[PDB]
Amino acid sequence: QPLLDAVLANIRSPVFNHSLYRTFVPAMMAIHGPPIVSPVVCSRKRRFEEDERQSIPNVLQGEVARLDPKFLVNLDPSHCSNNGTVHLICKLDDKDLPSVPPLELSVPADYPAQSPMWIDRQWQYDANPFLQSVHRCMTSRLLQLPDKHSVTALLNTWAQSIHQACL
Amino acid sequence: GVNLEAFSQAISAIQALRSSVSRVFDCLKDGMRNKETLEGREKAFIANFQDNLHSVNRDLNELERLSNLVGKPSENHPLHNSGLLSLDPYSQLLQAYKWSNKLQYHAGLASGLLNQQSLKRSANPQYVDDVISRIDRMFPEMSIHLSRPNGTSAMLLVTLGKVLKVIVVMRSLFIDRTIVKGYNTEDGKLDIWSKSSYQVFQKVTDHATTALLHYQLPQMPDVVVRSFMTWLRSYIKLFQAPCQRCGKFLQDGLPPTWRDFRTLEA
Amino acid sequence: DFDPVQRYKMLIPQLKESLQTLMKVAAQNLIQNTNIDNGQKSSDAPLQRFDKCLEEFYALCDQLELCLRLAHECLSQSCDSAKHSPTLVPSLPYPQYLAVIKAQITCAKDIHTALLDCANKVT
Amino acid sequence: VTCVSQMPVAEGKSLQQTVELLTKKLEMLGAEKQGTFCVDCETYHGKLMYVMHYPLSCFALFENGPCLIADTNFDVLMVKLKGFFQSAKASKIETRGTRYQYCDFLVKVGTVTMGPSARGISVEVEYGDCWSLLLEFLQSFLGSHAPGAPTVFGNAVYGPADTMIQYMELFNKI
C-alpha cells in the first residue's frame, strides 16, 4: 500500500546520486551510532596467478582417475594439446584373452559427443578369426549406446564385447 | 494453553519488522553500486518492500491469536515478592524452576541422542506386572484387563474402539505370542488359539508378531510395553494409505514408521 | 490499567498508521530534496523532519515488543508453577505453601550442588 | 459392515446380458466362487419376511425389527396367525444369484424377483463408518453407484440388520 517511496525511487532516474545520502544518512547516523559499523580491515589484491599451464581438459582426468586397474590408457604422438585432447592406447589387460588397443580419439571433454575412433580396424581385425568376430558384435553394440561417454562407457563396452564374443 | 508459541511468533514477527525497516532504509542509503547494463537495484527495493509488507501481514495475522490474558495473578507465584516484605528478604524459586526446566529438557535431548549407544555386548517378580498393566491401561480408549488363567502367564486382552480385540499373551516380561481377532473372542471360559479372521487380521497378527520381535530392548520392559501400546493405538483409524490407493488390496496397514499404508509396499 | 493483550490491540493500528505516515514523509522529503538538488525550484514549502516520525515509529515498535515480552514472561512463569502446586489464595494454607517452596528450592539447590561437586571431582 | 444395495437399471443389450457383464467384470477382478447365496425377503401386512443367508428368517418389519426368529419360528408364527393379518393379497417375490468372495469381501447380484427388476448389486466389508475403503473398492467395480443412507449418527455398532433394512427399502422402492 505505501507505494510512495517505491514510485519515487523508480522516478529517480537522473545520474546525480547525493540526495538520498543527505536525506537519509543524518537520521541513521543519529539513531544508529557506529563509528565503525564494519571495523574489519579490507585491502585486497585478489588475483595473483591461477594456472597450471600443463593441464589437459580436467573432465578427462576425472575419467582416467575413475578407471579400474585392469584398464590403462596413455598417449601416442599427440595432436591433442587442448582441442582433441585425446587419442589414447588403452590395453584391456584383464584375466581373459588380450586384444589390440584402440585409439578412441574424443572431442572436447564437455562431451556433447562420444570417442569412437576405430583406426587400426584395417589390418588388426581382418588378420585373425577371433579378432574378426570381436569387431562384429562390438560394432553392433556400440551402435546402441545413446550418447556414449569417452573413457568409462566406451572402454567398458569394449571389454564387455571382447569377453562376450569370446563365448 | 498454547499461547507461548503464539507469543514467541509475535516477538519474532516484530523483530523481523524492525530488521526489515532497518534493511530497507540502509539499502536506500546506497544507490546502484555497479550495473553497467541496467539498474537492477529496483528489484532489491521491491523485494525489501514486499518483505516489509510480509512482516506487517504476519503481525496482523498474529494479532488474531492470543485470545485473552486470564486472571490468576501468576498462578500462586506471589508468596514473598507480592507477599510479606519480610518473606522477600525470593529469586531462588524462579531460578530453581528455570534450572529444573533446562535440566529436564537437556537430559531428554541427551538421552534421545545417546540412544545409539556403543555397548558391545552383555558380558564381562509377579508384582510389578499388574502395576505396569494398569499404568498402560490408564491411556484413553485402551480398556484392557489381564486374566492370568494358567500359571504366571499374563493372558491379557485389549480392545480400543471396535470389536477387533487382541489376546496378547505375555511371559511376566517381553510379552510375545499375540493373536488378533475381530468381531467375536473367548470360547468356553478362557482365551483361545483360533486366530480366525477374514484374510485381513492375519496380516495384522503377522505385523504384531514382527513388532513384538522388533521392540526387544535389553532392559526396561515397561518402556517396551508402553511403546508397544502406543504403536498398537495407531490402528484406530485405518483410513489412510500413502504411496498407493486406499484399496490396492483387501487390507492396508503397516505403520512401523507411524504412518500406515497399503501392505506389500514396504 | 489495561491488559497486555488490550495494549497490543490498541498499539497495532497506531503502529500501522505510524508506518504509513513514515513512508509518506520519507517520500515527500526525498522528492523535495531531489527537486531542490536536481531540477528547478518547485517545492517551496516547509516539509516535515522525517526523523521525529521514524523515532516515534521505533518507539511504538519497541513498546509493543516490550509489552509482548512482559506478557510472554508472565504466562511462562505462571504456567510452570501452576503445574507444581494447587491454587490457594483469598485449598492450602500460606505458611505450608511457603515451607513447601523453601524445601523445593533447597532440594533443587542440593541436587545441583551435588552434581556440580561430582562433575568437578571426576576430573 | 453393512453396505446398502442399489438398483442400477441397465439397458441396451438385456438385463441378463448386463448381469453377465457385471459377473464377467467381477471375475476379471479376481474373485472366486463361494456358492449361490440367494436372499429372499417378502413383504406382508406392514409385516415382512427374510431368508438372507443363515437358518434364521428374521423379518424386520418395523421398529428396526427383532431379527432373531428362527428359520421356522417366524414362519410358523405367521402361519398360525391366520385371520389376524388379512393383507396377503399383495404378494411379494425375491431375487437370487451367486456369491463371490474376493478377499474379506462378498458380492451379491439381485436378479428379477418376479421378473420386473434390475440387477441389484450388494457388497459387505471385513470389520465395519469406514467408507473410504468401501468407496475405493466400489469405484473400481462400476460407475454410478453407492447411494449410501446407512445407520448414521448411531455411534449402532455395525448393525447387521442394516443390510436387511436396505434390502427392504430397495424392495419397496421397486
XYZ file of C-alpha atoms in Angstrom:
730
model
C 0.000 0.000 0.000
C 2.654 2.648 0.857
C 3.937 2.694 -2.721
C 5.029 6.346 -2.463
C 8.680 5.560 -1.735
C 8.670 2.865 -4.422
C 7.297 5.121 -7.154
C 9.640 7.956 -6.141
C 12.738 5.743 -6.155
C 11.605 4.487 -9.564
C 11.093 8.044 -10.845
C 14.580 8.996 -9.613
C 16.273 8.257 -12.949
C 18.943 11.066 -13.003
C 22.608 10.190 -12.574
C 23.312 12.522 -9.639
C 23.295 10.332 -6.510
C 23.668 12.577 -3.484
C 20.085 13.429 -2.478
C 19.489 10.028 -0.870
C 22.636 10.434 1.233
C 21.791 13.922 2.510
C 18.170 12.834 3.052
C 18.681 9.567 4.966
C 22.238 9.326 6.372
C 21.683 12.034 9.045
C 18.750 10.168 10.610
C 20.512 6.795 10.573
C 23.750 8.224 11.969
C 21.725 9.926 14.704
C 19.787 6.809 15.726
C 22.429 4.193 14.944
C 25.755 5.460 16.232
C 28.540 3.193 14.962
C 31.889 4.938 14.492
C 32.944 1.823 12.576
C 29.903 -0.295 11.726
C 32.287 -2.659 9.885
C 35.582 -2.375 11.797
C 37.174 -5.204 9.789
C 40.027 -4.121 7.518
C 39.712 -4.952 3.823
C 42.603 -4.282 1.441
C 42.678 -6.972 -1.219
C 44.683 -7.648 -4.344
C 42.669 -10.770 -5.034
C 44.205 -12.453 -8.091
C 47.918 -13.202 -8.021
C 48.071 -16.098 -10.512
C 45.841 -19.089 -11.227
C 47.037 -21.515 -13.917
C 48.926 -24.793 -14.009
C 49.540 -24.317 -17.775
C 50.087 -28.072 -18.002
C 46.521 -29.305 -17.579
C 44.647 -31.227 -20.257
C 40.811 -30.984 -20.015
C 40.064 -31.823 -16.378
C 36.895 -33.741 -17.256
C 39.015 -36.397 -18.966
C 41.295 -36.505 -15.920
C 38.318 -37.456 -13.766
C 37.570 -40.427 -16.008
C 41.208 -41.542 -16.113
C 41.111 -41.417 -12.318
C 37.882 -43.434 -12.139
C 39.373 -46.183 -14.328
C 39.848 -49.684 -12.951
C 43.362 -51.111 -12.515
C 42.559 -53.506 -15.365
C 42.442 -50.661 -17.890
C 45.392 -48.379 -18.613
C 45.483 -45.527 -21.117
C 48.388 -43.485 -22.489
C 49.212 -41.012 -25.251
C 50.606 -41.557 -28.756
C 52.261 -38.846 -30.885
C 49.636 -36.353 -29.845
C 47.576 -33.926 -31.892
C 45.870 -33.442 -28.547
C 47.207 -30.253 -26.893
C 43.774 -28.803 -25.975
C 41.078 -29.485 -28.605
C 41.091 -33.207 -29.343
C 42.959 -33.691 -26.065
C 42.974 -37.464 -26.502
C 43.807 -40.311 -28.805
C 44.922 -42.946 -26.337
C 46.221 -46.518 -26.381
C 44.114 -48.482 -23.896
C 45.247 -52.070 -23.434
C 42.489 -54.175 -21.869
C 44.782 -56.101 -19.544
C 42.445 -58.455 -17.675
C 42.019 -62.122 -16.778
C 40.676 -63.210 -20.167
C 42.352 -63.174 -23.562
C 44.051 -59.911 -24.603
C 43.444 -57.936 -27.779
C 44.653 -54.937 -29.799
C 44.303 -51.452 -28.259
C 42.069 -48.888 -29.991
C 42.680 -45.156 -30.383
C 39.392 -43.642 -29.130
C 40.055 -40.015 -30.021
C 37.392 -37.948 -28.267
C 36.052 -34.417 -28.711
C 36.347 -31.546 -26.169
C 35.794 -33.006 -22.710
C 32.453 -31.216 -22.269
C 31.243 -34.310 -24.164
C 28.361 -33.362 -26.439
C 29.692 -36.398 -28.314
C 31.497 -39.720 -27.866
C 35.009 -41.049 -28.542
C 34.933 -43.888 -31.097
C 37.880 -43.651 -33.491
C 38.349 -47.165 -34.996
C 41.796 -46.581 -36.513
C 43.553 -49.959 -36.531
C 40.444 -51.755 -37.835
C 42.053 -52.437 -41.212
C 44.859 -54.917 -40.565
C 44.317 -55.912 -36.930
C 40.791 -57.312 -37.165
C 40.860 -58.906 -40.623
C 44.052 -60.843 -39.844
C 42.637 -63.003 -37.064
C 39.445 -65.097 -36.987
C 38.736 -64.372 -33.319
C 39.561 -60.679 -33.712
C 37.192 -60.595 -36.690
C 34.321 -61.839 -34.526
C 35.363 -59.387 -31.805
C 34.790 -56.434 -34.137
C 31.459 -57.763 -35.449
C 29.264 -57.825 -32.338
C 31.146 -54.906 -30.786
C 30.206 -52.566 -33.632
C 26.528 -53.507 -33.302
C 26.693 -52.957 -29.543
C 28.363 -49.560 -29.944
C 25.650 -48.573 -32.427
C 23.274 -48.808 -29.448
C 24.853 -46.583 -26.788
C 22.871 -43.319 -26.622
C 25.472 -40.557 -26.348
C 28.244 -42.802 -25.032
C 30.921 -41.305 -22.779
C 34.616 -41.246 -23.574
C 36.655 -43.387 -21.201
C 34.479 -45.362 -18.801
C 31.465 -46.108 -21.005
C 33.300 -46.904 -24.246
C 36.109 -48.813 -22.521
C 33.668 -50.945 -20.518
C 31.622 -51.601 -23.659
C 34.786 -52.684 -25.478
C 35.815 -55.027 -22.661
C 32.306 -56.483 -22.376
C 32.122 -57.115 -26.121
C 35.618 -58.630 -26.146
C 34.746 -61.056 -23.354
C 31.253 -61.772 -24.733
C 32.156 -62.583 -28.342
C 34.791 -64.789 -26.707
C 31.849 -67.036 -25.742
C -2.538 -23.152 26.849
C -0.535 -22.892 23.630
C -0.232 -19.110 23.855
C 3.535 -19.328 24.430
C 4.148 -20.359 20.817
C 1.943 -17.542 19.516
C 3.756 -15.048 21.747
C 7.165 -16.238 20.540
C 5.958 -15.980 16.940
C 4.696 -12.441 17.570
C 8.011 -11.426 19.154
C 9.868 -12.842 16.155
C 7.495 -11.035 13.788
C 8.058 -7.679 15.493
C 11.822 -8.220 15.468
C 11.555 -9.079 11.770
C 9.552 -5.915 11.081
C 12.186 -3.798 12.832
C 15.013 -5.556 10.981
C 13.181 -5.158 7.664
C 12.674 -1.425 8.182
C 16.359 -1.130 9.082
C 17.417 -3.087 5.988
C 15.133 -1.040 3.723
C 16.459 2.273 4.999
C 20.054 1.026 4.913
C 19.798 -0.188 1.314
C 18.032 3.018 0.267
C 21.115 4.825 1.605
C 23.051 3.240 -1.291
C 22.357 3.761 -4.983
C 23.116 1.378 -7.820
C 26.603 0.089 -6.988
C 27.625 -1.382 -10.361
C 25.060 -2.323 -13.018
C 26.730 -1.446 -16.377
C 23.644 -2.596 -18.327
C 20.532 -1.636 -16.319
C 19.860 -0.584 -12.735
C 18.879 -3.818 -11.002
C 18.552 -2.033 -7.662
C 14.813 -1.610 -8.277
C 14.446 -5.382 -7.888
C 16.105 -5.345 -4.459
C 13.994 -2.329 -3.482
C 10.773 -4.096 -4.478
C 11.907 -7.248 -2.664
C 12.617 -5.324 0.539
C 9.274 -3.522 0.311
C 7.485 -6.842 -0.209
C 9.362 -8.196 2.814
C 8.131 -5.264 4.904
C 4.585 -5.928 3.692
C 5.017 -9.614 4.563
C 6.148 -8.752 8.088
C 3.220 -6.361 8.557
C 0.812 -9.050 7.347
C 2.411 -11.588 9.695
C 1.960 -9.219 12.634
C -1.666 -8.614 11.638
C -2.244 -12.374 11.441
C -0.609 -12.997 14.823
C -2.932 -10.317 16.199
C -5.785 -12.762 15.562
C -4.195 -15.199 18.027
C -3.672 -14.543 21.765
C -7.365 -14.686 22.619
C -7.204 -13.278 26.146
C -4.897 -12.917 29.138
C -6.514 -14.815 32.015
C -6.505 -13.643 35.623
C -4.924 -15.860 38.288
C -2.118 -13.397 39.019
C 0.845 -15.644 38.142
C -0.920 -18.801 39.406
C 0.062 -18.894 43.094
C 3.523 -17.494 42.317
C 3.257 -14.415 44.612
C 4.201 -15.635 48.079
C 7.109 -13.397 49.135
C 7.545 -10.968 46.220
C 3.996 -9.594 46.368
C 3.502 -11.036 49.856
C 5.095 -10.087 53.160
C 8.141 -7.854 52.809
C 9.966 -9.966 55.356
C 9.497 -13.089 53.256
C 11.188 -11.481 50.285
C 14.380 -10.511 52.251
C 12.802 -14.720 46.527
C 14.530 -15.244 43.172
C 15.642 -18.688 44.389
C 12.263 -20.199 43.484
C 12.281 -18.808 39.939
C 15.912 -19.833 39.470
C 15.033 -23.350 40.629
C 12.074 -23.526 38.240
C 14.151 -22.392 35.262
C 17.054 -24.681 36.169
C 14.723 -27.667 36.533
C 13.103 -26.999 33.156
C 16.508 -26.637 31.486
C 17.859 -29.782 33.154
C 14.798 -31.809 32.143
C 14.965 -30.691 28.511
C 18.737 -31.179 28.306
C 18.576 -34.675 29.799
C 15.737 -35.634 27.462
C 17.684 -34.454 24.426
C 20.856 -36.180 25.645
C 19.020 -39.472 26.154
C 17.346 -39.248 22.752
C 20.732 -38.600 21.158
C 22.775 -41.215 23.052
C 20.075 -43.823 22.383
C 22.531 -45.120 19.746
C 24.940 -46.255 22.442
C 28.203 -48.076 21.721
C 27.528 -51.046 24.012
C 29.497 -54.022 22.697
C 27.676 -56.886 24.434
C 26.349 -58.127 27.775
C 29.371 -59.915 29.235
C 32.387 -59.329 31.475
C 8.644 -60.791 40.045
C 4.871 -61.225 39.664
C 4.006 -57.945 41.374
C 5.081 -55.142 39.023
C 3.277 -56.740 36.066
C -0.144 -55.671 37.346
C 1.170 -52.160 38.029
C 2.629 -51.852 34.523
C -0.604 -53.172 33.011
C -2.645 -50.621 34.966
C -0.286 -47.786 34.005
C -0.657 -48.769 30.350
C -4.446 -49.088 30.683
C -4.558 -45.545 32.093
C -4.396 -44.376 28.464
C -7.686 -43.374 26.803
C -9.672 -45.658 24.504
C -7.462 -48.608 25.505
C -9.585 -50.519 28.025
C -7.640 -53.702 28.833
C -7.731 -56.314 31.590
C -5.492 -59.280 32.425
C -6.839 -62.675 33.496
C -3.825 -64.951 34.157
C -5.806 -68.218 33.893
C -2.910 -70.695 33.658
C 0.234 -70.147 35.704
C 2.138 -66.875 35.825
C 1.309 -66.217 32.154
C -0.387 -62.834 31.704
C -3.028 -63.685 29.095
C -4.349 -60.139 28.847
C -6.752 -58.758 26.253
C -7.067 -55.343 24.612
C -9.838 -53.574 22.700
C -9.688 -49.952 21.538
C -12.931 -48.855 19.902
C -14.080 -51.743 17.746
C -14.712 -55.463 18.342
C -11.228 -56.235 16.966
C -9.898 -57.303 20.395
C -6.366 -58.734 20.644
C -5.471 -61.582 23.025
C -1.816 -60.692 23.547
C -0.167 -63.323 25.751
C 2.804 -62.462 27.962
C 5.581 -64.077 29.995
C 5.780 -61.715 33.014
C 8.096 -59.710 30.715
C 8.813 -59.280 26.985
C 5.247 -60.176 26.040
C 5.054 -62.327 22.908
C 2.718 -64.758 21.118
C -0.054 -62.339 20.196
C -3.172 -63.176 18.172
C -5.689 -60.607 16.896
C -9.333 -61.455 16.192
C -12.257 -59.195 15.272
C -15.995 -59.367 15.978
C -16.068 -62.355 18.334
C -13.489 -63.800 21.321
C -13.266 -66.061 24.378
C -14.635 -69.569 23.890
C -15.581 -71.681 26.883
C -14.174 -69.792 29.866
C -10.757 -68.581 28.670
C -8.820 -67.291 25.669
C -8.195 -69.336 22.508
C -5.727 -70.130 19.724
C -8.318 -69.642 16.975
C -6.684 -66.741 15.088
C -9.681 -66.876 12.745
C -10.114 -63.821 10.533
C -11.101 -62.725 7.021
C -7.597 -62.912 5.495
C -7.068 -59.373 6.848
C -6.400 -59.752 10.575
C -3.943 -62.494 9.631
C -1.699 -59.770 8.217
C -2.380 -57.784 11.394
C -1.209 -60.728 13.506
C 1.894 -61.079 11.341
C 2.657 -57.377 11.799
C 2.075 -57.649 15.547
C 4.470 -60.596 15.776
C 7.027 -58.613 13.777
C 6.583 -55.698 16.185
C 6.942 -57.913 19.257
C 10.150 -59.289 17.749
C 11.165 -55.715 16.836
C 10.861 -53.875 20.175
C 13.119 -56.330 22.033
C 15.137 -53.974 24.238
C 17.950 -55.146 26.538
C 16.215 -53.742 29.635
C 13.348 -51.507 30.810
C 10.400 -53.706 29.748
C 7.898 -51.093 30.960
C 9.034 -48.661 28.264
C 8.870 -51.585 25.826
C 5.230 -52.286 26.668
C 4.404 -48.565 26.551
C 5.943 -48.260 23.084
C 4.090 -51.407 22.020
C 0.795 -49.936 23.202
C 1.288 -46.541 21.553
C 2.269 -48.409 18.384
C -0.883 -50.535 18.559
C -3.021 -47.441 19.172
C -2.334 -46.330 15.584
C -4.826 -48.957 14.345
C -7.831 -46.878 15.451
C -8.372 -45.164 12.079
C -7.417 -47.432 9.132
C -8.345 -44.528 6.811
C -5.050 -43.750 5.084
C -2.771 -45.328 2.500
C 0.168 -43.285 1.161
C 2.367 -44.471 -1.720
C -0.733 -46.224 -3.126
C -4.521 -46.033 -3.231
C -6.916 -46.803 -0.383
C -7.893 -50.187 -1.812
C -4.806 -51.510 -3.595
C -5.550 -54.830 -1.866
C -8.161 -56.115 0.568
C -6.310 -54.709 3.593
C -3.932 -51.798 4.104
C -1.738 -51.403 7.162
C 1.904 -51.447 8.259
C 2.791 -48.468 10.490
C 6.239 -49.161 11.976
C 7.121 -45.637 10.847
C 3.942 -44.182 12.412
C 2.232 -43.900 9.010
C 0.071 -46.834 7.927
C -0.025 -47.624 4.204
C -1.035 -50.486 1.930
C 0.772 -53.756 2.573
C 3.111 -55.384 0.040
C 4.664 -51.929 -0.404
C 7.492 -51.957 2.150
C -4.503 -0.297 33.803
C -5.402 -2.436 30.795
C -4.387 -5.995 29.958
C -1.299 -6.623 27.803
C -3.496 -8.060 25.045
C -5.563 -4.863 25.088
C -2.407 -2.750 24.863
C -1.251 -4.880 21.925
C -4.582 -4.496 20.120
C -4.560 -0.729 20.684
C -0.909 -0.381 19.640
C -1.006 -2.376 16.382
C -3.214 0.038 14.366
C -1.334 3.085 15.640
C 1.798 1.220 14.556
C 0.392 0.710 11.054
C -0.642 4.368 10.821
C 2.799 5.471 12.011
C 4.411 3.293 9.340
C 2.171 4.819 6.667
C 2.970 8.362 7.793
C 6.669 7.453 7.897
C 6.599 6.262 4.291
C 4.674 9.383 3.267
C 7.054 11.829 4.954
C 10.074 9.953 3.596
C 8.705 10.169 0.051
C 7.853 13.862 0.438
C 11.257 14.771 1.875
C 13.026 12.760 -0.825
C 11.094 14.329 -3.707
C 11.638 17.790 -2.220
C 15.380 17.199 -1.863
C 15.597 15.881 -5.428
C 13.641 18.795 -6.905
C 15.857 21.187 -4.915
C 19.092 19.411 -5.901
C 18.481 18.102 -9.452
C 15.758 20.119 -11.180
C 14.159 23.524 -10.689
C 12.709 25.049 -7.533
C 9.191 23.658 -7.182
C 8.802 22.509 -3.551
C 8.955 25.916 -1.861
C 7.035 24.742 1.200
C 8.136 23.670 4.699
C 8.398 19.886 4.912
C 8.460 17.652 7.964
C 11.583 16.285 9.636
C 11.179 12.551 8.807
C 13.221 11.941 11.965
C 10.572 12.891 14.523
C 8.471 10.311 12.648
C 10.923 7.409 12.474
C 11.905 7.896 16.117
C 8.253 7.675 17.167
C 7.716 4.619 14.964
C 10.711 2.895 16.559
C 9.384 3.878 19.986
C 5.996 2.318 19.228
C 7.642 -0.844 17.899
C 9.848 -1.124 20.989
C 6.955 -0.514 23.378
C 4.837 -3.169 21.664
C 7.763 -5.602 21.794
C 8.205 -4.858 25.499
C 4.501 -5.372 26.228
C 4.501 -8.708 24.405
C 7.716 -9.756 26.172
C 6.170 -8.937 29.552
C 3.045 -10.919 28.670
C 5.129 -13.887 27.497
C 7.253 -13.897 30.654
C 4.128 -13.639 32.810
C 2.387 -16.542 31.077
C 5.550 -18.660 31.164
C 6.208 -18.119 34.874
C 2.520 -18.728 35.605
C 2.351 -21.950 33.582
C 5.324 -23.794 35.090
C 4.309 -23.033 38.685
C 0.641 -23.887 38.104
C 1.680 -27.491 37.398
C 3.714 -27.569 40.632
C 1.093 -26.659 43.267
C -2.665 -26.152 43.764
C -4.451 -22.807 43.923
C -4.844 -21.383 47.433
C -5.337 -17.634 47.919
C -8.088 -15.181 49.014
C -7.233 -25.364 49.271
C -3.971 -24.939 51.181
C -2.543 -22.590 53.821
C 0.035 -19.918 53.048
C 2.691 -20.956 55.620
C 2.586 -24.522 54.302
C 2.960 -23.173 50.764
C 5.978 -21.095 51.790
C 7.573 -24.045 53.589
C 6.988 -26.317 50.589
C 8.505 -23.748 48.226
C 11.520 -23.326 50.511
C 12.014 -27.094 50.719
C 11.704 -27.404 46.934
C 14.299 -24.682 46.357
C 16.603 -26.278 48.931
C 16.271 -29.725 47.347
C 16.907 -28.414 43.831
C 19.946 -26.454 45.019
C 21.228 -29.553 46.820
C 20.836 -31.692 43.691
C 22.626 -29.083 41.578
C 25.444 -28.699 44.113
C 25.939 -32.461 44.426
C 26.035 -32.884 40.649
C 28.487 -29.993 40.250
C 30.767 -31.308 43.000
C 30.754 -34.798 41.489
C 31.474 -33.477 37.993
C 34.351 -31.394 39.364
C 35.753 -34.353 41.314
C 35.507 -36.531 38.190
C 38.495 -34.627 36.787
C -20.071 -53.537 7.777
C -23.462 -53.145 6.104
C -23.270 -51.901 2.508
C -26.679 -50.936 1.145
C -27.885 -52.352 -2.156
C -28.567 -50.249 -5.245
C -30.831 -50.761 -8.264
C -28.847 -49.882 -11.405
C -31.340 -50.099 -14.271
C -29.065 -51.165 -17.112
C -30.299 -51.336 -20.697
C -29.076 -51.623 -24.276
C -28.263 -55.330 -24.520
C -30.517 -57.010 -21.915
C -30.967 -57.333 -18.167
C -29.435 -60.816 -18.210
C -26.707 -59.509 -20.526
C -25.884 -56.719 -18.068
C -25.841 -59.231 -15.207
C -23.438 -61.418 -17.189
C -21.264 -58.384 -17.944
C -21.112 -57.465 -14.253
C -20.237 -61.066 -13.382
C -17.503 -61.073 -16.031
C -16.064 -57.830 -14.657
C -16.106 -59.289 -11.139
C -14.369 -62.450 -12.357
C -11.764 -60.297 -14.105
C -11.244 -58.528 -10.775
C -10.073 -61.883 -9.401
C -12.948 -63.156 -7.254
C -13.617 -66.860 -6.757
C -16.999 -68.550 -6.417
C -18.461 -69.232 -2.972
C -21.867 -70.795 -3.618
C -25.248 -69.311 -4.506
C -26.445 -67.185 -1.574
C -29.973 -66.451 -2.762
C -31.529 -63.845 -0.462
C -35.301 -63.711 -0.043
C -37.426 -61.070 1.706
C -41.191 -60.936 1.122
C -43.292 -58.020 2.343
C -46.588 -58.547 4.158
C -49.289 -56.725 6.108
C -46.841 -53.821 7.492
C -45.077 -57.120 8.132
C -42.187 -58.605 6.137
C -40.042 -61.706 5.675
C -36.368 -62.580 5.277
C -34.337 -65.570 4.109
C -30.962 -63.838 3.856
C -28.074 -66.262 4.340
C -28.205 -68.364 7.874
C -31.006 -70.555 9.268
C -32.855 -67.578 10.760
C -35.774 -65.992 8.904
C -35.610 -62.596 10.593
C -38.471 -60.404 9.383
C -37.530 -56.808 10.192
C -40.999 -55.362 9.650
C -40.684 -52.118 11.624
C -39.128 -50.594 14.750
C -35.735 -51.840 13.437
C -37.057 -55.424 13.563
C -36.153 -58.106 16.091
C -34.086 -60.107 13.609
C -33.926 -63.092 15.947
C -36.701 -65.516 14.915
C -35.504 -68.868 13.611
C -35.970 -70.088 10.048
C -39.192 -71.822 11.128
C -40.126 -69.700 14.160
C -41.470 -66.618 12.375
C -42.861 -68.782 9.569
C -44.870 -70.991 11.931
C -45.958 -67.893 13.858
C -47.281 -66.247 10.688
C -48.949 -69.486 9.575
C -50.689 -69.731 12.950
C -51.567 -66.012 12.810
C -54.424 -66.601 10.373
C -57.196 -64.018 10.344
C -55.080 -61.512 12.278
C -53.360 -60.148 9.156
C -55.690 -60.166 6.139
C -53.442 -58.361 3.642
C -51.949 -61.440 1.969
C -53.422 -60.438 -1.407
C -50.468 -58.263 -2.434
C -47.794 -60.939 -2.805
C -44.027 -60.398 -2.822
C -41.177 -62.016 -4.740
C -37.454 -62.430 -4.100
C -34.187 -62.365 -6.031
C -31.337 -64.883 -6.299
C -27.938 -65.317 -7.912
C -24.357 -66.165 -6.967
C -21.981 -65.017 -4.231
C -18.261 -64.392 -4.749
C -15.631 -63.614 -2.119
C -12.612 -61.738 -3.470
C -10.800 -61.129 -0.175
C -12.639 -60.344 3.082
C -15.414 -59.290 0.695
C -18.709 -60.517 -0.704
C -20.794 -59.658 -3.760
C -24.445 -60.498 -4.364
C -26.420 -59.795 -7.537
C -30.130 -59.197 -7.051
C -31.901 -60.597 -10.091
C -35.536 -60.160 -11.117
C -37.682 -61.086 -8.115
C -40.946 -61.625 -10.013
C -39.491 -60.754 -13.423
C -39.598 -56.957 -13.397
C -36.461 -55.805 -11.545
C -32.935 -54.540 -12.110
C -29.610 -56.191 -11.243
C -29.309 -55.279 -7.575
C -25.671 -55.301 -6.516
C -24.709 -55.757 -2.872
C -21.388 -55.981 -1.026
C -20.011 -56.175 2.516
C -16.797 -55.414 4.417
C -14.390 -57.067 6.848
C -14.757 -55.216 10.167
C -17.068 -52.263 9.558
C -18.231 -45.799 9.426
C -15.205 -46.962 7.406
C -16.449 -45.875 3.985
C -13.116 -44.805 2.463
C -12.047 -48.358 1.611
C -15.605 -49.341 0.667
C -15.864 -46.493 -1.843
C -12.327 -47.073 -3.131
C -13.307 -50.658 -3.931
C -16.757 -49.770 -5.291
C -15.422 -47.182 -7.746
C -13.154 -49.826 -9.289
C -16.224 -52.053 -9.767
C -18.532 -49.811 -11.818
C -19.545 -46.182 -12.249
C -22.722 -44.645 -10.832
C -23.376 -46.465 -7.543
C -23.066 -46.133 -3.751
C -26.273 -44.324 -2.725
C -25.495 -44.831 0.953
C -28.031 -43.943 3.664
C -26.520 -46.074 6.467
C -27.425 -46.060 10.170
C -25.599 -42.766 10.609
C -25.390 -40.884 13.921
C -25.528 -44.196 15.782
C -22.086 -44.242 17.386
C -25.375 -48.823 16.031
C -22.035 -50.652 16.271
C -22.014 -52.198 12.782
C -25.677 -53.127 12.674
C -26.127 -56.458 10.900
C -29.842 -55.835 10.305
C -28.907 -52.660 8.404
C -28.431 -54.878 5.353
C -31.978 -56.162 5.834
C -33.281 -52.602 6.202
C -31.530 -51.605 2.971
C -32.952 -54.659 1.198
C -36.457 -53.809 2.415
C -36.067 -50.194 1.285
C -34.884 -51.372 -2.136
C -37.762 -53.841 -2.485
C -40.274 -51.151 -1.529
C -38.578 -48.780 -3.994
C -39.250 -51.242 -6.831
